[model samples]
Target: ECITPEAIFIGANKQTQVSDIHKVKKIVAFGAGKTIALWDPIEPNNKGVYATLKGHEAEVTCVRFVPDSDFMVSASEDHHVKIWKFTDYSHLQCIQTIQHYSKTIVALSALPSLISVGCADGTISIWRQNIQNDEFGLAHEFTIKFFYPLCLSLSKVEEKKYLLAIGGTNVNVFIASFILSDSGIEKCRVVAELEGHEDWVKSLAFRHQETPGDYLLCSGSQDRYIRLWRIRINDLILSNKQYKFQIDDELRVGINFEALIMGHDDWISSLQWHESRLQLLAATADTSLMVWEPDSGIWVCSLRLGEFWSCLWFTHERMDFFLTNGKTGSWRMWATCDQRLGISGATKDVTDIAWSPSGEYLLATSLDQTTRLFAPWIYDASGRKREIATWHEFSRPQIHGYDMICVETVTDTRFVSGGDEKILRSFDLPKGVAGMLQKFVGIQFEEECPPMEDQLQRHLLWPEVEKLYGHGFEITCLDISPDQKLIASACRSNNVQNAVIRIFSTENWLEIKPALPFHSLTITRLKFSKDGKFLLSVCRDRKWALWERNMEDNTFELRFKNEKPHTRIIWDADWAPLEFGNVFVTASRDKTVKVWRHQKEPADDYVLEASIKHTKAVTAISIHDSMIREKILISVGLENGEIYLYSYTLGKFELITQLNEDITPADKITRLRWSHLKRNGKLFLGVGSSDLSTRIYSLA
Candidate 1:
């Protein structure tokens, strides 16, 4: 069992990006940002970044060490594909730079014995290594317009004969045959186009399972899906010496279309096929790694691992015990047979979230990329609300993009979501594809993609009825007035002079930026009073301001600025609706939780009623909707990996209990919230971490 702070892989900093990993000649690494660190997987711990190669100007596009571990090939966006000798770390030198002046090199693959090139200009060329001249020479060249390969794979079967496969912007995989004859002529011909995927396949892998077994071809795409294409040797007539495709026939040539597959809901970054284990491994954009084991003839997703939780990017291992690398720049091994995901595959940083009053749905926004519609009614059955295995998991909602950042619900079906593109998408949920979450336990089958009514709603465009767009930089936060007439949002960057908020009419979605106030910097949090009479804007400059609404003119006037509120940046805050009075809270990086009271009369000077101190910076704070009225429980998450529950009545708070936790160092809490309802008969807490981790907790 891996313990917190125990499994942390620490080394690489922000500057060094760990890109691709390959096993050959001492587990070679493709560190496009720098050099490829060579590691001998068998025993490589401190042997991190060594025995690498260089010679690329721009971001490294492709790198492969293949069958010839001695000579590795690499390509870069700086306009050069070079071959380097990996004899030792000391002698890393580029042997030759293949000069091809095209718009750009799209894809490259180093065959076990040769080099293959594909360009965005539709140029597909093969290069051969001259054993005598120690140079590479063009073997064959061709161009198929409307066809640019994004990735390719190749293998040689016989003397001067090779099978090639490439995938691109289309759903089909293109195949061809390349052969050279003693007559000194190189010939190439199109073989077949394997089809199945619905999106542009970016990751492709082709490997021979065994000497006499079968050849496996797997493709993964941004559509978050995978398709396995298999071909047995005998069917291709390899024994019959059939190397050419039939001129006028559907090309099956031993290749099976629906052989095996593992579909996902996140960015498929990389994949590797394990011939021995009969499994394929894939790493996703959400920082999780999954394994697909071939059950008989079908590929089954046997195991799924975690949000390595330290960085946003992750590249998993090539074999049985999965190894992962993170933005922390360190490589570590992970073993969790049965992964427990507490929540959504947030398209990006989930900066803001909203729960329906009826507890029927949830609204979460992240980086203008996606929105998650969580069936609010789904609750954990284990009598625990905080554990993933015991908490509610959302059915995928279709969240379209603005590089979206914040979300606000005017109603369960009528919500306004904002993104970086500076647009407020008003949603009509009744019109949502199918806004229901059914626990169809038996829904798993060949219909991994069975058509569900709301499948398209899983991702829909921002509504046209209220497409409000008018901001210089991207908007980062959003809040709706309780009256449901106006909506406010915070932007990513401020005006040439000050930060700005563009309010819009909830009815027509027209901008109300007429006389709205602007913050001093990028605003992070915006909340409207329960009465919709006052609006609070939290700025990153360690301060919070209250704007009072003028009911007559429908204008907001700055009321009070909590000047120099915290010694550090204030991350978030929330409001409470207790019958007692008007109370709101702010969480900051300065290890303080200050609760302020604002009476209807605005007397007592918007006094700081109570200040709760913590051992560390409080990154997140929340109050269940029922907390103020019934439960009266407050939840606060700290950067130190601890969560504290507070019991309050009248104007005093008593720290009830603190959930002690010590997980991976990267698991610092970023945001925390109370569930729409209690779990296991106790209030539930949801905590979002810096690492792709969202955890829930329940009071005993």
Candidate 2:
């Protein structure tokens, strides 16, 4: 559950609302109607309809991945949820003919042993996965009812006790407490009715944590407002009256209204909160999603989804990132970064790309499931097109039916791939002695179950290799030290805990130290300082933390932790190339890039150096090393896909020039990097785009 929204794929048309998104292995499958598309969100423009999961007579409404199973269940208006196996896109079984109030099932929730269904008719039904014969040969059906129930959420309020919160259309929210008994199942009547909203309830969510009285019910309605209701057990116990009866003896304390978020101009579509940051994110029909601090009732940031919005989720693992889909069949990721890190190219949507140890080549994996290699063309100071090489279909046979999610190259000639098919694959140089050089490094598989053994194995297609283990969740970001002596990977844990950043010795492939609890959120980016003394990490919660390397003890201690530092999404960060140790830059969705210097005071750990230079979220940044003049920092930002370069000087950044003014409006500038290669024997920079291309620029 260390989920982070890494990449987002948008459809070609505007009418396709992405109904559901489920990540199977590395491949993220998104469905709208009968179209099931796969994507590698890390790469630029690497998304398309990979495979269509057809046969649904109606629109696909929701999709969920079964635990420890290779199959996925998709619920459609066809009044059924179909289970499809991933191996060959084969249909396994169809559970159909369920009772629904809306003729269309509005929502579905699947637990370990029970599948809960809610219909448009405002009825709730629980179905057991299996049925057994009784002594009298009688079968039992467990059913519940709620008038005009729009959505249902299940939570364990107490041991041996479950609470189901149902949201109705007419501002009626019902809470039912159920218990299991020896004979059958003991069900209590509706004990609490949450009444507040006056509009059609569209969505419902509950918080699951280990806190007493922490149960919170959130509902998004056509009223264009989101309401949070706190469930008080004491109130329920005090009022013994059950099912439609009023409890007169107990104090009828009115429900405490925690917060009301206002920003959406249209009906609110969905709402989710990041546990690490405690920020509520809501998607709406107005083609936008906004994040707010429920306590302060302050709107932090807003992202325009661009017409026909459907569903959105703050990838449970990665909080800083979120995936959004539209009726247009498009899905994309909205990422933010700290303004201090000088990295650029803030892309609205990312295809798929893997960053290397030295930041040399950005491996772009396209929607066609092909890996394209790109490097910034440093000779053209104007940031023009520069294409180094493109690798088409690296692991076609190995990952035949899967959509590649990520591609990591160990060397210029060897790379690893993981995708939707629940498998890890490898790619090597195709010609000459290069093939032999990488022959021993083949792809391997780590099965989904048997949790501990479910780790990536290095295929023995090549020799002189080593493999490490102990990651229970899918690997999100992988990094190697500048010297390539140490390797680190950020992975989600199987127990639904915080993400783990594990460091390993490159030479022996032995774990160098215990997994570092770097952040409370999913770690999206990790980098070792040039001297390798500090490790920088960015999480989904819009917070960044730095870990100082203990060379002698071989440990890492958190040096800085900032929560809700700025009211924007922090996308990427980078250490300044200068000799200054405390200087670094961050790109963010706040429409301004910033530079920061770490100080001594704990509350004043960081000092901002620059701001307000870009009209859009700064995506990428790079600094130029100067011998004759003062060093200059350059940043690239995305505004309707145009790349704007800004120069930093006099403690502030100024607009330098526009790179690629006629690229036909790309989704966003995905990445930007300054080439270590000197320009005209001096210095140059490179920029990458989400439009499946890269450009090089020379700074004089």
Candidate 3:
């Protein structure tokens, strides 16, 4: 059985180069986890990656589309280049694989019939398309000896002549001109060298002016500067502009400094010239994007956009827009008309996900140091009543100074998030967010709240309420009891002293006293029973322990410990509903998920109720909070990125369905959760993965 998930969120990869992402005919393609993912933003329900082309054995480095053709080219760390053709049958078919590079391919530049590939070892290979067969063939190979290439740009100079701008470890850009001969590339050499950058150049772009053979070259460097160079052929009037000239028999080319645009605080990462204008869009490592345009022959920063990596200028639906992928691993689409929008998702490993008490919103915590809230936006901004709702990012709950690791929803309006830091911080939904939710999504918060700051000043934010401290190390996992009175949290550790589970009162936000200690390694997950009578904890030591809540003191005490619960370290554990009678499940790296039930009279030990064997290490598990028609559903997340759903009734497990690789995560599954609230007999499952994305699937 299989289910196709309607993706709610899709994230971009943190590729360092802008060339790794490209757009053609309203379809966007990008390199992601050794595969190339294609996404069409115009297609409704195309929430994330719509299709993936897999071939690269390692991470993909660059992706490009041939000008005005169906051919798409991609290079990867696998040291190979492949070309795929989009057919009229509505599919992509790989037509060629070029394996001339001996090292990892770092850069790629494509023209109508030519492509330039750069390797990590300072080697560049040029491929030319055979006119008759229309297939690319290796035409020229060259080495840049001491200048490992970081970026490349190709511009047409004359009829069959072109100029290639190379930038990299060298402070100056090397411009080479070459002519396409019937046999191969001929007379290719560095024609000019322009010097100005104080650091290594990282990005290069060339734009053609109205005058033929007149072009402007923009180079961005790690030295936090952008240099604009003007290149022209046979410009008779040579003014006071600093010039570098090269002669080729009857043809003479000249290069001169144009302008120096500076504003970014850190190194530049991507640069792109406008399709038909002198406007330039540059993205930098400092999370800044600047749009430069010439006003009275003086370049000025006209617009600015984030630690952004890729910047692409494209047109959609007759509207001009520029897209940027940043440190957050999300793409932002800014339109020239006015509307700025983006689909938000995590770019780093997503460690935890939680649903609100009412199941109206979802929260995801990521190693990217941000906790995001996703909820349905039902209202129509244009005043037309909408019958259907769509989900979007409602607010950022927490943007910490450290990478976030775990999070747990405590109440309807509050949540606790643990970051790479030693303490857990609790946050409350602000008045502004509650107002927006009530106005648009129809969710209302009765209590009053304070105002806070978000990414943009006039935006939604979650205010920090208090800090729950006591952990000696970084917090790894946490959970709130059903009663919502106590919070159980754990931290990373090597010995038992620091491996104990720390309990804190939700009211006072204070540690509840002597911690419950047993395991000798980090506790990976802690869960409380729906009845609030017991707690389940799994550790990195391959052990599972059950702690009974002491009613008198309201403190928990270790009642049972299985030192050899699994052959390998346990990753997650979850307690079934009270109807299951003290039943819990533990998932382990040993590739097993065992259901355990406690025996009342005979023995104090918990006995295995059932065992499920899987192909990959089970990393996360979640049992539905309540039984539906005398049966419960269990979702298992694995290290290999597959997800399995099973139905359990009276100790028997039956296969329900599984998520196919196309709809599943491309990396390890870190967390899985079922929303307690159901709509039209359908249940929602939220998934967090190491692929830097969070997705929700609906099953009936």
Candidate 4:
């Protein structure tokens, strides 16, 4: 009765082309693979893939639910059709094995008790379910031969009668009708052959609620037009009557052509009709879905996906809810409501989100790895202020040897980045020096690499040099040593058997190590002691191991191994400033943050000082250290997207502040680093997001 923009499924990949979508009891989304994904349209986040129905050797091309039955039918490119029981996703039986068709099966439809299939080789096969001794089986029906058919639709016309519409490459639509006798004999005859399209017909549908004898056929083509047809059924039916009961010229009626609905700008791929309404929804490859009223020839609403939308369907029980599949390998739900949730479940697209410490500026990175900065509105002395009017977008300075997976900025003018290419790059202020640092990061296009330049030509602000090598894996974590003259880099082998920790002397830009090796899993986090004497590394296997260096021999030895510290995957570890007992904190995927203190025990152990629950996965944590006052630790949770500032006192940590806003919600704070630089007695914190944007916060 009403049309509105409702629910939106946000995160979908750009390459996931959907083949078919069916709104059965639940929203069943099928694509060009072996898996049949199920979703709840009313509940956007409630998605469970029931089973991967795997009988077809090739891609599953089409799926249709049988009416008034507990089964569904699917056709694949392997020249086989399957009927499955919907309850436990068990294959009931193989219905048809097509061999004469030289290409894959692309389309399928079921009406009343008849099943129809369209193959890529322009062959349409029809079958009827037979009850033999009270068991259902398929019998060889009829074949409507064509050049190349892409889609097909079958609907009931009159009592004990049916109509079949086929879409193909010749720009012609073939409409035929069939009658089944009480003795199980079937007869089919061509009712109409309409030819008006100049390109391939991609999709077709027939209104089921219309008058029985009035044939209203709807079809979409690559020519970007939806054409309507009102064909006379008596003429073709009488032609067959002459063979049985002799019909005269006075009873012969000719089939007629109807109007064409034109609005789509691209090839239509799929079509669906609202069960109780007169609206028809059509999906097109031009990234748009149109709702049209066929009787009035009026285009009602158009829903556009940012990328090519390949498939769409209405929710079985809910009229306002629908689902769509796009080229990004993403299946999303659309509702006639306001709240749209994007679920990026198994997709491998890399998303970069960054937020400043104060929640004022947000930065995001897309699949391209390009960075964009957005400044949300802020309130100053006037109660409300707008500092960032618009968004600033640009690509990060490309490092020659790295792919740029993670980026962290400690200050407004300085940032550090590293990724799979095994190179760490640093960027700083002073425009001229910034350009030189970009070159040092190995960003040399033939024109940028120096031709006749000296090796000693270093800028005044040249990044305090420190490089570490000889590790067989990419470095995952980096931290500056407490003395500011050393750096710690953690690397793990692909086999997860050996993990390497490298310590580089910044003063000499050399590796100072017997190369500490420990843990049986990937090293997740690494940190340096405040006194510059102890090094700590935590692994995915829930082991926190400590190592100390021999100042004279420059050799390192294991000091402690805490096996039962963290309960989940450890993400980050932080050490409190010198005055705070030199204690360290660790965050994990277990939704709890634990503070650990180094104990001088008989066996060298560290006790868990505090266990605080954040209600979500703890992504990043930082302890704020201001020279003028006592230190307090700050933690950012990923699930609810909230920042909690905690004060460590009386041997425990207590929450002091919670950062909340209207525009930006704290979902996943990936990176958080406190800066020593102050402007007007106010401290600044840098925060990054999985959205790839960075924001800055001012702590007063």
Best by lDDT: 3
Model 3, span 334-438: residue lDDT tens: 676543555566656788999998887889998878898877655655434346455667788767788999998998799999988988899998887777667
RMSD of 2: 24.0
Residues 1-700, model 1: lDDT tens digits = 1111101111221221133444433353544233333444344222233233445554455566646456777666666778777545434467888777455777777665577777777787888777566667786778766777787777664556667888888777777766655332255776877767777877677777454665677887657677777665545641222234532222234566555455545666667766354667777767777777665756677877665322121223542445554432334443334221211233223455666544444555544265655443322232223221212233334345456556667865567666656555677654322322322111111112112212333344335455777776666777888788888866776542437767778877777756455567777788888788988877787888888898986778888777788888888888886454688888888888888886547453466777877888887788766754343668777776577778766668887766543221123466666656643355555555544333444554
Candidate 4 lands at a TM-score of 0.49
* TM-score of candidate 1 against the unseen true structure: 0.50
* lDDT of the structure predicted as candidate 3: 0.77
- Candidate 2 per-residue lDDT over residues 1-700, each given as its tens digit: 0111112222332222234444334455555333343444444323233333444555556665544455555656667656555554422333333423336676665444444567664566654443352111111233344356567776655554666677766566667656534443456446677666787666777775654545566777768788776555445443322333322333222234455665545566667765445567776666666676543544445444443344444343353555554322334455563111101111123334653334444454433443444332222223333232111112211213344445555656555554433334455544432222222212122220000100111121222243456566555566666666666666643332547777776556677766787466556566677677878776656667777888885677877667764566666677765454467676677766667777777665766766664677765555543322354556565644556556555486566666533321244665555554442343444444554333444555
**Global Cα lDDT for candidate 4:** 0.54
Tally clashes: model 2.
Answer: 76
Instruction: Show model 4 residue runs off by greater than 4 Å.
Output: 1-33, 43-61, 75-80, 88-103, 132-138, 141-146, 181-185, 188-191, 213-215, 231-255, 264-270, 284-287, 294-307, 310-319, 326-343, 348-700
lDDT-better candidate, 2 vs 4: 4
Residues 429-516 of candidate 4: C-alpha lDDT, one tens digit per residue: 4455333323322121222211111121122232423333555565566665555565666665644444777766545647786667
Clashing pairs in 3: 287-306, 287-307, 288-306
Q: How does each model score on lDDT?
A: 0.58, 0.50, 0.77, 0.54
Q: For this target, which candidate reaches the highest TM-score against the unseen true structure?
A: 3
Cα lDDT for residue 468, model 4? 39
Worst 10 residues of 3 by lDDT: 448-457
Identify the runs in model 3 with alpha carbons over 4 angstroms from their true place. 8-16, 19-24, 30-61, 74-106, 128-138, 156-162, 169-173, 177-202, 208-270, 282-307, 316-318, 381-388, 448-459, 580-582, 600-604, 628-630
